Design a protein around this ligand. Structure first.
Ligand code: MIY
Lengths: 1022, 50
């Protein structure tokens, strides 16, 4: 091809233009986003039952709908939560390529037929099916900077005007409200109303009658009588639209003409819908708006688009309500892709410098500076060609592959400054010869690199996608590189081709070296023996090295996680939240930007006794000392918070991929499998736990990820005694309920918007058990009766959060690997400890620890094929079931040194390392292949020496190696290996490549010529 | 019911929720005077109707 392409030179300038122009067009089409999708798809169904409780909510709702989740395709497993806040959440995870959109339909659809079997109070709140994906694009806050507005107030404005405003903007995915939206609060008084002989029932059925909406006909329309002339629409009753109108509700009229309005029976503010989660930002009332991705949107483009729409409505904005920004991924994705792109622009300057200061030009260096930015740009096209996206994973994809594709340029061009110097021919004629000794050997370094890469993109479920992420990118860069090295590069440098502090100086250094190879070629085994020590190096270096997933990173935010004991209260939790918030401002005002703290939503549950504090920091610019970064701040804070009496308060950095797997943890589910009750299983749990602790050797940190049984106050209607008086189990229940739990009566329209109307006892009459007294019910004959008359109450222990795995009641158990042991073997002990638990009880693996179980080890099984497909591939490049075997032995040479990220640093065998490792084996074999080729060319075509060719081979190669290799080991370490500014992954990739590159060169130069001679001699002898 | 008692009551609620469905091009709705809603979502030529 290329020979008959350096004759045709302006055609290979076209092909260059398309590639480029096409690659440019993709840049402006490509989705941009911190990460792509990697978690299996999951559909979450969640419901409310106001005033409920774990058991009730569980047996009335969760069980039911579970018995119905059948006939849905691709369901991986199903987990559920029923907790004393009256809330259920069922989460169904799917297999991998499962269309998220079809998975929801099916769920949602199969739900729609269980609805009838649910309680009227729940069907009313509505059940939600929606796709879960805890990957937030951001979270605007909307605080008030006057103190004029409350939590509930601010939330309402946010709902009324800005919410939809956002929801419609340039591809936002979903907006969630951090608040209510006002509800007609009718706050009953038991005493104000036991007077008029009234219950909450009488109150409720009035709200129905007075706040309804009736229908009646038109006038003509429906078949009218001859020659009618008027047709109009009758307008009957329609909803009350004010707190005022609600006050006036004929509740009672007795002999007297007494006028008992709802006003005369309760407060009637216009408050929040639910009242049990307290949002404040830097100490003052706050509401939020958490926006999501948007399926093929631009993370930067919609990031801008939000701030625009927020500005286009910043006037209007009452009193003084600032919009605030405690979480925006954008900054990260920006000054992390503004880097990377710098790595590209820079490792270019390098491959002009470690090129000119070696070849000496302005027209020889201008060739790979035309070649690289093409394969690169052109690679984008190929990404876009398979849906892919500009994203952290795919970005470093290319960076981490720049060395592989610079070495395709350098190699070509200087392998002419060889040829045109000995028998020194012209440009248009020497390039015609050079592109002949390398030609077929690139078409082999292609195939070769197609294995040792493609075999990723085939890994397990969850983390298997991250791999593909790099895989396709690299193989896309790599193959598109060879593609120009056969088409543009030659055509280019056979045209435009023909300082002093070098030349004669390198001229001797080649000779001092080339001779060292000789002699280390007579015994032919002093070094072969040295090698076996290096292969042992890596083979023991391997096992020693700890493994990981993706190293955490200063992302500019982190979390404080506060948890009060059993019975604790909202207000009682607020006090704690404050200290936390106080500490962070006054005591960290040089890093902390804000504390958005939510009092109510915790981790292992919800409830008054739990909270979280989202804390967002100042710029990286403004947080300079390493001790002003995150793993610093959190470390301090976590300790600092050990002066709190009862109130476990942690602070942890969020993992890189938020909506994804976690620590070397296992995820353990303890199922039940027979009639065994809650307690029996609670006991069962307690063994495996207490047992697991006896073995800190196999390491642990085993722990229930759920809540412990609490006390609860059971009222108990005496059935008979009820019949004895005129008292109806229904009138009973409603009152006790609606008072103490709250009930949702119906809707009304508030300023052009439908909103709910709740009805429940003012807080004063619903606090202590001794408060039951207050509540009376109108009986048969019409005399108010006290609760003590028909009931009796004992205290007892229940569960505020009952959990289940795959329909059977579960208790999930978390736990840590071991300081020396593998995630795998910690599991394997666990199963054993499980197998001795009282008959009935079972276990199952979920989370990552399932994505692990059902994704074997694979790596050894997969590369076993890569390898075979390299020897198979490499033989055919030459012509031998032997020669290729010389090229392979380079694998370990890069490994050691790469693997020496134990001695020059303390890190972990991770995804970045693993791909860095591959990039290095890539240039390693590439070297070996061009050598074993150059040794075979002038030995089959020149008939030269069994050993003489191998000396003339490593003579001709030593220069490329050095050029490209210095190019890499510099520009692969700019801020790479030395950062702190959205870094982490930076040091990770680079370090593995640096030390691996050092050893892969400063060592293969001596060894591959040894390899070519040690092989050959073994075959043809016997 | 009638426009301002349906446009308010139904048409909004539905419309509020027509946020972010791939290849959306433009939505248009009308309430009634007899209680009758027609939200229509037109998608980008190409997009899969199912
Ligand atoms: C935890 N989540 C991020 C936040 C953060 C700040 C907030 O200010 C809030 C939430 C959750 C949302 C959930 C919403 C939900 N929805 C909008 C009706 C909801 O169903 C409930 C509920 N638990 O029933 C709320 O409490 C809720 O009204 C609420 O009070 C919230 C709100 O107060």
């Amino acid at each position: 091809m290329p020979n008959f392409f350096i004759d045709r030179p302006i055609f290979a300038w076209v092909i260059a233009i398309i590639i480029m122009l096409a690659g440019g067009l993709a840049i402006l089409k490509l989705p941009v986003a911190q990460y792509p999708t990697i978690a299996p798809p999951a559909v979450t169904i969640s419901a409310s039952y106001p005033g409920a409780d774990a058991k009730t909510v569980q047996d009335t709702v969760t069980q039911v709908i579970e018995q119905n989740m059948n006939g849905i395709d691709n369901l991986m497993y199903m987990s559920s939560n029923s907790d004393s806040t009256g809330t259920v959440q069922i989460t169904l995870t799917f297999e991998s390529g499962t269309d998220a959109d079809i998975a929801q339909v099916q769920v949602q659809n199969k739900l729609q037929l269980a609805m009838p079997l649910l309680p009227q109070e729940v069907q009313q709140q509505g059940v939600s099916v929606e796709k879960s994906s805890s990957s937030f694009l951001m979270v605007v806050g909307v605080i008030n900077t006057d103190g004029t507005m409350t939590q509930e107030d601010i939330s309402d404005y946010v709902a009324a005007n800005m919410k939809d405003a956002i929801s419609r903007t340039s591809g936002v995915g979903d907006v969630q409200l951090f608040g209510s939206q006002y509800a007609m609060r009718i706050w009953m008084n038991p005493n104000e109303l036991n007077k008029f002989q009234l219950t909450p029932v009488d109150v409720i059925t009035a709200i129905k009658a007075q706040n309804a909406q009736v229908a009646a006909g038109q006038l003509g329309g429906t078949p009218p009588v001859k020659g009618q002339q008027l047709n109009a629409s009758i307008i009957a009753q329609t909803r009350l639209t004010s707190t005022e109108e609600f006050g006036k509700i004929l509740l009672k009229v007795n002999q007297d003409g007494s006028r008992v309005l709802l006003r005369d029976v309760a407060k009637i503010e216009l408050g929040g819908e639910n009242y049990d989660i307290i949002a404040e930002f830097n100490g003052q009332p706050a509401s939020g708006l958490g926006i999501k991705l948007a399926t093929g949107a631009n993370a930067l483009d919609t990031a801008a688009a939000i701030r625009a729409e927020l500005a286009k409505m910043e006037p209007f904005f009452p009193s003084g309500l600032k919009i605030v920004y405690p979480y925006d991924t954008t900054p990260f994705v920006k000054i992390s892709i503004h880097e990377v792109v710098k790595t590209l622009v820079e490792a270019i300057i390098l491959v002009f410098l470690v090129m000119y200061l070696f070849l000496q030009n302005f027209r020889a260096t201008l060739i790979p500076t035309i070649a690289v930015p093409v394969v690169l740009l052109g690679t984008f096209a190929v990404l876009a060609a398979f849906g892919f996206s500009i994203n952290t994973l795919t970005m470093f994809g290319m960076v981490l592959a720049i060395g592989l594709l610079v070495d395709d340029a350098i190699v070509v061009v200087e392998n002419v400054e060889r040829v045109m110097a000995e028998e020194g021919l012209p440009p248009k004629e020497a390039t015609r010869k050079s592109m002949g000794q390398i030609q077929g050997a690139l078409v082999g370094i292609a195939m070769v690199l197609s294995a040792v890469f493609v075999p990723m993109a085939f890994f397990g479920g969850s983390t298997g996608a991250i791999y593909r992420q790099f895989s396709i990118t690299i193989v896309s860069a790599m193959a598109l590189s060879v593609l120009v090295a056969l088409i543009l590069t030659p055509a280019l440098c056979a045209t435009m081709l023909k300082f002093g502090w070098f030349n004669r100086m390198f001229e001797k250094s080649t000779h001092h070296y080339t001779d060292s190879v000789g002699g280390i070629l007579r015994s032919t085994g002093r070094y072969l023996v040295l090698y076996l020590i290096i292969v042992v190096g890596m083979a023991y270096l391997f096992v020693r090295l700890p493994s990981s997933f993706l190293p955490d990173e200063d992302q500019g935010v982190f979390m404080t996680m506060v948890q009060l004991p059993a019975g604790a209260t909202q207000e009682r939790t607020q006090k704690v939240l404050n200290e936390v918030t106080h500490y962070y401002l006054t005591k960290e005002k040089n890093n902390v930007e804000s504390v958005f703290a939510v009092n109510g939503f915790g981790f292992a549950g919800r409830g008054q006794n739990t909270g979280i504090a989202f804390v967002s920091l100042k710029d990286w610019a403004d947080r300079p000392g390493e001790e002003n970064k995150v793993e610093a701040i959190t470390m301090r804070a976590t300790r600092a918070f050990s002066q709190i009496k009862d109130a476990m308060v942690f602070a942890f950095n969020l993992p890189a991929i938020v909506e994804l797997g976690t620590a070397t943890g296992f995820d353990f589910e303890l199922i039940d499998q027979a009639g065994l009750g809650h307690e029996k299983l609670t006991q069962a749990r307690n063994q495996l736990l207490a047992e697991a602790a006896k073995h800190p050797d196999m390491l642990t940190s085993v722990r229930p990820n759920g809540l412990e049984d609490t006390p609860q106050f059971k009222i108990d209607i005496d059935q008979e005694k009820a019949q004895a008086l005129g008292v109806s189990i229904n009138d009973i229940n409603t009152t006790l309920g609606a008072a103490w739990g709250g009930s949702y009566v119906n809707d009304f329209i508030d300023r052009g918007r439908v909103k709910k109307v709740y009805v429940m006892s003012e807080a004063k009459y619903r606090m202590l058990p001794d408060d039951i007294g207050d509540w009376y019910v109108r009986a048969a004959d019409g005399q108010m009766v006290p609760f003590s008359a028909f009931s009796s109450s004992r205290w007892e222990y229940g569960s505020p959060r009952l959990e289940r795995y795959n329909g059977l009641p579960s208790m999930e158990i978390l736990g840590q690997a071991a300081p020396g042991k593998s995630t795998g073997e910690a599991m394997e002990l666990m199963e054993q400890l499980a197998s001795k638990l009282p008959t009935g009880v079972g276990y199952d693996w979920t989370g990552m620890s399932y994505q692990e179980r059902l994704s074997g080890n694979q790596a050894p099984s997969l590369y076993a094929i890569s390898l075979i497909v390299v020897f198979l591939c490499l033989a055919a490049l030459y012509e031998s079931w032997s020669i290729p075997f010389s090229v392979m032995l380079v694998v370990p040479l890069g490994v050691i040194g790469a693997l020496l990220a134990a001695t020059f640093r303390g890190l972990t065998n991770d995804v970045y390392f693993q791909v860095g490792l591959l990039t290095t084996i890539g240039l390693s074999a590439k070297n070996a292949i061009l050598i074993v080729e150059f040794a075979k060319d002038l030995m089959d075509k020149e008939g030269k020496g069994l050993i003489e060719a191998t000396l003339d081979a490593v003579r001709m190669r030593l220069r490329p190696i050095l050029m490209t290799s210095l190019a890499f080991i510099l520009g692969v370490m700019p801020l790479v290996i030395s950062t702190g500014a959205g870094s982490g992954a930076q040091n990770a990739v680079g370090t593995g490549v640096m030390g691996g590159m050092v050893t892969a060169t400063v060592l293969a130069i001596f060894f591959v010529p040894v390899f070519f001679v040690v092989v050959r001699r073994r075959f043809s002898r016997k």
